[PDB]
Design a protein around this nucleic acid. Sequence first.
RNA 1: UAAAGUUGCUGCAGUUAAAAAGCUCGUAGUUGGAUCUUGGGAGCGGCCGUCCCCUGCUCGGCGCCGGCCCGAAGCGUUUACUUUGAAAAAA
Lengths: 83, 149, 83, 185, 129
Amino acid sequence: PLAKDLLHPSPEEEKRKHKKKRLVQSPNSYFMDVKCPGCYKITTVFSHAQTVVLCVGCSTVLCQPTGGKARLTEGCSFRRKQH
Amino acid sequence: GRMHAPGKGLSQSALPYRRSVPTWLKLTSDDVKEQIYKLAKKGLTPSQIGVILRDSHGVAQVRFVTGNKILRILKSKGLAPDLPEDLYHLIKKAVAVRKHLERNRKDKDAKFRLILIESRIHRLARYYKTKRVLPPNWKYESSTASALV
Amino acid sequence: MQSNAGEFVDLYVPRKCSASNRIIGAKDHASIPMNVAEVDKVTGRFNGQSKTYAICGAIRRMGESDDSILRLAKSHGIVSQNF
Amino acid sequence: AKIVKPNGEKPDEFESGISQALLELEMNSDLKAQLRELNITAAKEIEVGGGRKAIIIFVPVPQLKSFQKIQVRLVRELEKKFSGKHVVFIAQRRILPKPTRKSKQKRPRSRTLTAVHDAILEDLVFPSEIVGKRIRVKLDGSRLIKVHLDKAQQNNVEHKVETFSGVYKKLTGKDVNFEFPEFQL
Amino acid sequence: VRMNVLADALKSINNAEKRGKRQVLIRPCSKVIVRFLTVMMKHGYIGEFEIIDDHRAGKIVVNLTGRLNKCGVISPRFDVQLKDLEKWQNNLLPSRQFGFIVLTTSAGIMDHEEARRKHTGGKILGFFF
RNA sequence: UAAAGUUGCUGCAGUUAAAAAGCUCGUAGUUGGAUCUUGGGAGCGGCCGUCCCCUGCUCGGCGCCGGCCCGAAGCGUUUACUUUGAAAAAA
């Protein structure tokens, strides 16, 4: 295909492409409102956490570090937040 | 590509276009700076401070919340260590390899990887001397490199 | 191709590919001037007037000749903008 | 009044009348404690395209962030006090010329032409933050900046787009269009 | 590493023209890249391009026509007096009828023909025909 | 000397014709990312093209009731670059 609209790519194409290689450089990570069932409050966890995220006074461990997107403990709900 | 490896990796972070603080984050610049001072005094590095912050305190960048970056915040109060933390970790790695070579004289690949870490230290050493954050009469001395943890 | 007086001096004005704007040599034997028939929009019949698109051999062996005619017909109101 | 010019010169009754209007919003309305400390430098009225007028109120830079917390609510009161006018807030940013061969300290990049022109553009739109700049260079050489604004606070700010073009056109001389990209965020 | 940014950009739009692409992305945006392109645009060789600001070095998308035969850089930026400019346009342009040699002068980045008018030599950036 | 693009700055070669160090580090050498003045005010010709402008602080002359308008010497980042000027024996 000769005539590609490089000005205006479809969102499907930029969601596919590497974060650095997009028309405008955009991260694939995000922050998320995470809450454990014991404690009241909601901690903001980073998707690719890479640390053992504890709640206040260690009510429980929330997020265990992995290769990429860090796994949340079984019983901990999350909502990804945007602006 | 990499400095002392044939690797040609494209693994860096990608900051978002918008430099604005988000809606959800209510933390004042002072509160973040007071938390940075609480983390730095606990025996932590600007690399580690930035991680511990952006994991469990929902802070994208310190430079976006505050006006300034983390080593500059430690420096302005007087908590930043004498020699930079990236040159610290290279010297620390070099000491650990040169400690490994005290028993394993046959390990020619460790000796080769030492000459690479040596070369990276001398290369930062000369950089930090041009930017005047190291004194010019400083030297990576393998005798007194073990003296510096 | 005027001289100083204004006389058109070269012996023929060569065609030029409608896709790439690259001139078509006297011996580019893979060229194609394709005539697309027009329509009386109420009836749907051949008028007698037709649109003429030229393509150089280079694009034809490149395999981009169909997508070029597709854009040229869409950019002529023949093919639907929707498509 | 709250009209505090840096020079030793008086305003017109226009700018003092705006400072009177913000003294009325201090003394009468609820937002009094968050307007005592807040002060205003200058203001202007410009003819924007069509049969509309655009009113622009300049602000000191260090108090601008305190004005950012009280922007849209205070715009509402000025939107119902001046009937058929769009009110917008720019920080009066001091600008230094390029140090030439002919012509003292280092010129800070905050006080430069581009940083101020981009900070003015950032502050024209408080409810919407800028999501992408696309500078078209047209066939005659003349530029056209295309600011892509957020889908959040679209309807709140979309009517002021026709104003914003004219307000930026006056201060910089840069013909700017504003769009709303749908597909990223 | 990347050293001449203008070089990368000109070769990139050259390789895009040769293939017959209608528009090309040139990844690092300089000031010198925009000036070169505006000079090519004013002589009709390219269409209306546009720069893409990420809060870094920007990108440019250029709308290519099929008019640009070649677009080249000269590295290093040799320093050209008015006397020498004829000997550069003799060995770097196809004809004396068309083709241009863009050079950064004190006046600004412009073609050899405007450099002759203004009576100002400067450093050669590249050429296009 | 040209021919010799068979010494290659212009301008050559190095998979197999002669040719890339066994490999890596490395000091001189060489080359080094983006980014810091722009929009205008004024006139002529038939929207466009050329022209005028975007630093201050001793003595004077278009003068005015110590100041302002104007000129002169001096102070005003460093080069490289380019343009002009001075100067440089003839043959």
